[PDB]
Design an enzyme around this catalytic site. Structure first.
Site, mmCIF file in Angstrom:
data_model
loop_
_atom_site.group_PDB
_atom_site.id
_atom_site.type_symbol
_atom_site.label_atom_id
_atom_site.label_comp_id
_atom_site.label_asym_id
_atom_site.label_seq_id
_atom_site.Cartn_x
_atom_site.Cartn_y
_atom_site.Cartn_z
ATOM 1 N N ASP A 21 46.576 -40.127 71.937
ATOM 2 C CA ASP A 21 45.624 -39.928 70.826
ATOM 3 C C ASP A 21 44.467 -38.997 71.251
ATOM 4 O O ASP A 21 44.012 -38.183 70.443
ATOM 5 C CB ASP A 21 45.076 -41.293 70.306
ATOM 6 N N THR B 98 42.517 -29.523 71.637
ATOM 7 C CA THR B 98 43.696 -28.768 71.232
ATOM 8 C C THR B 98 44.754 -29.681 70.606
ATOM 9 O O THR B 98 44.962 -30.806 71.062
ATOM 10 C CB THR B 98 44.297 -27.985 72.441
ATOM 11 N N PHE C 141 47.980 -29.299 70.597
ATOM 12 C CA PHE C 141 49.216 -29.386 71.384
ATOM 13 C C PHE C 141 49.162 -30.501 72.413
ATOM 14 O O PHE C 141 48.104 -30.758 72.950
ATOM 15 C CB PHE C 141 49.469 -28.065 72.111
ATOM 16 N N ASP D 31 49.180 -31.121 75.528
ATOM 17 C CA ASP D 31 49.097 -30.290 76.722
ATOM 18 C C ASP D 31 48.229 -30.776 77.879
ATOM 19 O O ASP D 31 47.838 -29.959 78.721
ATOM 20 C CB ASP D 31 48.591 -28.911 76.307
ATOM 21 N N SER E 29 45.160 -31.715 77.739
ATOM 22 C CA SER E 29 43.799 -31.223 77.595
ATOM 23 C C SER E 29 42.778 -32.320 77.927
ATOM 24 O O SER E 29 41.611 -32.030 78.194
ATOM 25 C CB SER E 29 43.556 -30.711 76.168
ATOM 26 N N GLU F 221 35.252 -45.082 78.025
ATOM 27 C CA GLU F 221 35.001 -46.136 76.943
ATOM 28 C C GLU F 221 35.452 -47.472 77.456
ATOM 29 O O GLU F 221 34.850 -48.488 77.142
ATOM 30 C CB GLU F 221 35.736 -45.992 75.571
HETATM 31 C C1 HEM Z 1 40.405 -50.962 74.334
HETATM 32 C C2 HEM Z 1 41.071 -50.016 73.592
HETATM 33 C C3 HEM Z 1 40.365 -49.016 72.606
HETATM 34 C C4 HEM Z 1 39.033 -48.882 72.315
HETATM 35 C C5 HEM Z 1 37.890 -49.736 72.916
HETATM 36 C C6 HEM Z 1 38.914 -47.783 71.306
HETATM 37 C C7 HEM Z 1 37.726 -47.326 70.712
HETATM 38 C C8 HEM Z 1 37.552 -46.313 69.764
HETATM 39 C C9 HEM Z 1 36.303 -45.821 69.126
HETATM 40 C C10 HEM Z 1 34.964 -46.283 69.350
HETATM 41 C C11 HEM Z 1 36.632 -44.822 68.275
HETATM 42 C C12 HEM Z 1 35.701 -43.961 67.370
HETATM 43 C C13 HEM Z 1 35.872 -44.359 65.876
HETATM 44 C C14 HEM Z 1 35.146 -43.691 64.884
HETATM 45 O O1 HEM Z 1 33.923 -43.421 65.107
HETATM 46 O O2 HEM Z 1 35.696 -43.345 63.824
HETATM 47 C C15 HEM Z 1 38.110 -44.690 68.397
HETATM 48 C C16 HEM Z 1 38.898 -43.747 67.734
HETATM 49 C C17 HEM Z 1 40.243 -43.585 67.779
HETATM 50 N N1 HEM Z 1 41.141 -44.366 68.464
HETATM 51 FE FE1 HEM Z 1 40.610 -45.954 69.614
HETATM 52 N N2 HEM Z 1 40.170 -47.281 71.016
HETATM 53 C C18 HEM Z 1 41.067 -48.020 71.786
HETATM 54 C C19 HEM Z 1 42.459 -47.883 71.787
HETATM 55 C C20 HEM Z 1 43.217 -47.015 71.067
HETATM 56 C C21 HEM Z 1 44.651 -46.958 71.092
HETATM 57 C C22 HEM Z 1 45.569 -47.925 71.971
HETATM 58 C C23 HEM Z 1 45.037 -45.919 70.210
HETATM 59 C C24 HEM Z 1 46.501 -45.424 69.855
HETATM 60 C C25 HEM Z 1 47.663 -45.986 70.372
HETATM 61 C C26 HEM Z 1 43.815 -45.381 69.660
HETATM 62 C C27 HEM Z 1 43.695 -44.364 68.761
HETATM 63 C C28 HEM Z 1 42.463 -43.874 68.245
HETATM 64 C C29 HEM Z 1 42.397 -42.670 67.361
HETATM 65 C C30 HEM Z 1 43.530 -41.802 66.860
HETATM 66 C C31 HEM Z 1 40.942 -42.472 67.078
HETATM 67 C C32 HEM Z 1 40.333 -41.300 66.216
HETATM 68 C C33 HEM Z 1 40.124 -40.117 67.242
HETATM 69 C C34 HEM Z 1 39.542 -38.843 66.696
HETATM 70 O O3 HEM Z 1 40.414 -38.040 66.296
HETATM 71 O O4 HEM Z 1 38.298 -38.597 66.657
HETATM 72 N N3 HEM Z 1 42.720 -46.065 70.197
HETATM 73 N N4 HEM Z 1 38.607 -45.607 69.285
HETATM 74 O O1 LIG Z 2 37.558 -44.720 72.951
HETATM 75 C C1 LIG Z 2 37.441 -43.896 72.007
HETATM 76 N N1 LIG Z 2 38.533 -43.481 71.337
HETATM 77 O O2 LIG Z 2 39.860 -43.980 71.708
HETATM 78 C C2 LIG Z 2 36.145 -43.386 71.653
HETATM 79 C C3 LIG Z 2 35.089 -43.806 72.351
HETATM 80 C C4 LIG Z 2 33.720 -43.302 72.040
HETATM 81 C C5 LIG Z 2 33.512 -42.371 70.996
HETATM 82 C C6 LIG Z 2 34.677 -41.967 70.286
HETATM 83 C C7 LIG Z 2 35.964 -42.450 70.595
HETATM 84 O O3 LIG Z 2 37.089 -42.011 69.868
HETATM 85 CA CA LIG Z 3 45.782 -31.365 73.501
#
Ligand code: HEM
Ligand SMILES: O=C(NO)c1ccccc1O
Ligand SMILES: [Ca+2]
Ligand SMILES: *[C@@H]1O[C@H](CO)[C@@H](O[C@@H]2O[C@H](CO)[C@@H](O[C@H]3O[C@H](CO)[C@@H](O)[C@H](O)[C@@H]3O)[C@H](O)[C@H]2NC(C)=O)[C@H](O)[C@H]1NC(C)=O
Ligand SMILES: *[C@@H]1O[C@H](CO)[C@@H](O[C@@H]2O[C@H](CO)[C@@H](O[C@H]3O[C@H](CO)[C@@H](O)[C@H](O)[C@@H]3O)[C@H](O)[C@H]2NC(C)=O)[C@H](O)[C@H]1NC(C)=O
Ligand SMILES: *[C@@H]1O[C@H](CO)[C@@H](O[C@@H]2O[C@H](CO)[C@@H](O)[C@H](O)[C@H]2NC(C)=O)[C@H](O)[C@H]1NC(C)=O
Ligand SMILES: *[C@@H]1O[C@H](CO)[C@@H](O[C@@H]2O[C@H](CO)[C@@H](O)[C@H](O)[C@H]2NC(C)=O)[C@H](O)[C@H]1NC(C)=O
Length: 595
Positions: free
Chosen positions: A108, A184, A186, A188, A190, A258
């Site tokens: 992700d 990016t 891709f 890759d 990054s 994080e």
């Molecule tokens: C302990 C595990 C995790 C924590 C503490 C965590 C925490 C966070 C936080 C704080 C955000 C920002 C949300 C927002 O402001 O909209 C985020 C976004 C996101 N998380 Fe998680 N995450 C975790 C695990 C995962 C896992 C396992 C996946 C996929 C299998 C995932 C996929 C995503 C995606 C796709 C975003 C949006 C990213 C972007 O494009 O800006 N996360 N996560």
């Molecule tokens: O852990 C995160 N995403 O998985 C995450 C953490 C802090 C700010 C934005 C984020 O997307």
């Molecule tokens: Ca990439």
């Protein structure tokens, strides 16, 4: 002239059309359209954005405005009434290791990042938003319900800032608001090397001609490297324990620290780059630093692509895998490789796979110390537990021997994330990732649940009975109705995740469709996809498909016993073999002979 013009958050460079290496920014991947898939460009739109005022205000901003005739429910209320639960018993996935969850976050982060809007440090804006809970400009607070215990304990709201958008940063007025992807598109690696030339260079060890990545100088792990510390104070990592005073790590991606298990995966990858680079220096003594860096980097990107597409996706999509990702036919220059806005929400199915505790295991895979099992919330932005509490070896064993949380319609997201999330910018362990996801859906102008069902050619429930049949759950479908009043208003993140899982997979129909399209596209539209003729030689390819996450562990940790299939649930000692029984990457096909 379609809305073709705007292009502001982006670069300055030329393309070398015969370079065998990817650029750091993603530019030049596609020859006819150079900026396609590059970082710091807008997320693609598969469907038109849906804002309250048609251009930028999210639904729920103006309390008097409705969505299809109804008020949209508060994000935190949906969180409380639907997403929460108290009993962690019986919630673990019986056939998915903790690594299954962790790889998802890695993939992700490699693909998407929409950072929040900054605009002001030494600004009452950060104050006026958290202290007084006043919506206005980029402050779009998550208000608490009546009867919410956080009201008695935390305040009237949870601060929340809207995501950045292409073009500027200050107020914009004509076309619809488009969010930014800072990385990016891709697959890759990054997240290891960076998406900007600025950071990519800073991450490298340029005082030595070996093509290595900079490593920590303050701390070592039994002779193995740690990522270097980050240079910005205040750092959220020293805040969680001002006594230990250990800063966050510096990686290709800003989210690396994080949580302790993510930082752990980043360290494994950093180590592989160096291992690969010094191993290549041995076979090709004449290659210079740059060559070593690019060549190791190219290998590491192939590794991430292989593990994701051979081992990870098949167990996420299950039987739907073949339906969305047919066998590779070769590179297609007509395919849009950009990550879509909705994908960044669909990929958030992983949040429901995170368990409440993280364990450290000793060499026999038994509890490591008296306080081996810790609550997830104490590990957010925690780097001190790594540097001062045993290195990564105890954490990696936990990744292999513990299980992920299983998505459950009655038990969706753990309280460790739903009530105790720590945000790098604030100081309490009191945020709600679920309410934030819902709020972010609206912030990004997402179409409702039924718009996406239609997009994927799936039925679109209009009534309670209709929603019960799709969800196959009477009471869930009817909490959903009481809060939303029509399936058309159901936010995609909660709607997509509420569906029963497809056979042999871990997501439902809607998500399988959204995830599967996206992945098919970033594979087919990548000129540097590892299987694309000419990227690697035939012999290099035969060698690359022998990689496994197990081998990566063996070569970069002091762990000597690992399972053969790291993503499924494995029991020690039965499912664990000796590292010497495991396939290595054979790098001889990379040996050159310039005479
Ligand atoms: C302990 C595990 C995790 C924590 C503490 C965590 C925490 C966070 C936080 C704080 C955000 C920002 C949300 C927002 O402001 O909209 C985020 C976004 C996101 N998380 Fe998680 N995450 C975790 C695990 C995962 C896992 C396992 C996946 C996929 C299998 C995932 C996929 C995503 C995606 C796709 C975003 C949006 C990213 C972007 O494009 O800006 N996360 N996560
Ligand atoms: O852990 C995160 N995403 O998985 C995450 C953490 C802090 C700010 C934005 C984020 O997307
Ligand atoms: Ca990439
Ligand atoms: C726990 O999950 C395991 C992995 O998802 C699962 O084993 C997998 O079962 C599938 C059944 O479709 C098999 O898939 C492979 O089948 C042949 C190999 O014989 C290949 O030609 C196919 O391409 C496909 O990869 C495998 O046997 C296996 N998959 C892997 C990657 O090892 C277990 O059945 C699950 N355990 C329980 C108790 O349910
Ligand atoms: C902030 O970080 C502190 C230092 O990393 C940490 O204290 C350290 O952890 C415990 C104290 O509870 C001690 O660890 C144990 O060390 C040996 C094991 O090898 C035991 O025999 C000892 O009895 C002891 O319990 C460390 O001595 C201690 N170090 C210091 C400098 O105090 C804090 O717990 C952290 N605080 C928070 C709130 O997280
Ligand atoms: C950059 O690379 C150099 C050389 O590989 C690193 O220094 C060497 O590695 C360790 C730690 O310094 C010791 O074995 C020697 O002192 C060094 N050997 C040589 C030949 O210099 C250095 O640590 C790296 N720098 C960074 C910031 O990662
Ligand atoms: C390359 O990708 C394009 C874009 O996805 C493919 O386009 C297909 O072609 C039909 C018409 O021939 C278009 O209407 C659709 O966009 C695509 N088909 C379907 C069923 O959606 C194209 O087929 C690919 N080209 C090659 C040579 O594989």
């Amino acid at each position: 002239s379609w809305e073709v013009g705007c292009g502001a958050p982006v670069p300055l460079v030329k393309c070398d059309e015969n370079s065998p290496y990817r650029t750091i920014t993603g530019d030049c991947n596609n020859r006819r359209s150079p900026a396609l898939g590059a970082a710091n460009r807008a997320l693609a739109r598969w469907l038109p954005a849906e804002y309250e005022d048609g251009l930028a205000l999210p639904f729920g901003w103006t309390q008097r405005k409705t969505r299809n005739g109804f008020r949209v429910p508060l994000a935190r209320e949906v969180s409380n009434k639907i997403v929460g639960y108290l009993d962690e018993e019986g919630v673990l996935d019986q056939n998915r290791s903790l690594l299954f969850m962790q790889w998802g976050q890695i993939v992700d982060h490699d693909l998407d990042f929409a950072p929040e809007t900054e605009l002001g440090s030494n600004e009452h804006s950060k104050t006026q938003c958290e202290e007084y809970c006043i919506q206005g400009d980029n402050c779009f607070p998550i208000m608490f319900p009546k009867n919410d215990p956080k009201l008695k304990t935390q305040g009237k709201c949870m601060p929340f800032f809207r995501a950045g958008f292409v073009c500027p940063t200050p107020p914009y007025q004509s076309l619809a608001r488009e969010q930014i992807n800072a990385v990016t598109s891709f697959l890759d690696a990054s997240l290891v090397y960076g998406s900007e030339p600025s950071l990519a260079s800073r991450l490298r060890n340029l005082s030595s001609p070996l093509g290595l990545m900079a490593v920590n100088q303050e701390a070592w792990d039994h002779g193995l490297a740690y990522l270097p510390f980050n240079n910005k104070k205040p750092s959220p990592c020293e805040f969680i324990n001002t006594t230990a005073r250990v800063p966050c790590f510096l990686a290709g991606d800003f989210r690396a620290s994080e949580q302790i298990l993510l930082a752990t995966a980043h360290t494994l990858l950093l180590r592989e780059h160096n291992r690969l680079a010094r191993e290549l220096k041995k076979l090709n003594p004449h290659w210079n630093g740059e060559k070593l860096y690019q060549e190791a980097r190219k290998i590491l990107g192939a590794f991430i692509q292989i593990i994701t597409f051979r081992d990870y996706l098949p167990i996420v999509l299950g039987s739907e895998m073949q339906k969305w990702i047919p066998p590779y036919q070769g590179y297609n220059n007509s395919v849009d490789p950009r990550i879509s806005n909705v994908f960044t929400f669909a990929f958030r199915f992983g949040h429901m796979e995170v368990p409440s505790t993280v364990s450290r295991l000793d060499e026999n895979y038994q509890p490591w110390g008296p306080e081996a099992e810790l609550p997830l919330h104490t590990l957010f932005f925690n780097t001190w537990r790594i540097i001062k509490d045993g290195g990564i070896d105890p954490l990696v064993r936990g990744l292999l021997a513990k299980k992920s949380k299983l998505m459950n319609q009655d038990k969706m997201v753990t309280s460790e994330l739903r009530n105790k999330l720590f945000q790098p910018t604030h100081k309490i362990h009191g945020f709600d990732l679920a309410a934030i996801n819902l709020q972010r859906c609206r912030d990004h102008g997402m179409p409702g649940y039924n718009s996406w069902r239609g997009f994927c050619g799936l039925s679109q429930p209009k009534t309670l009975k209709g929603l019960q049949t799709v969800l196959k759950n009477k009471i869930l479908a009817k909490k959903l109705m009481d809060l939303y009043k029509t399936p058309d208003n159901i936010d995609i993140w909660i709607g997509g995740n509420a569906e029963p899982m497809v056979e042999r997979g871990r997501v439902g129909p809607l998500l399988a469709c959204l995830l599967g399209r996206q992945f098919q596209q970033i594979r087919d539209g990548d000129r540097f996809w590892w299987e694309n003729p000419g990227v690697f030689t035939e012999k290099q390819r035969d060698s690359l498909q022998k990689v496994s996450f197990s081998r990566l562990i063996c070569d970069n940790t002091h762990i000597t016993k690992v399972p053969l299939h790291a993503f499924q649930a494995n029991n020690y000692p039965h499912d664990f073999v000796d590292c010497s029984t495991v396939d290595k990457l054979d790098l001889s096909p990379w040996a050159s002979r310039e005479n």
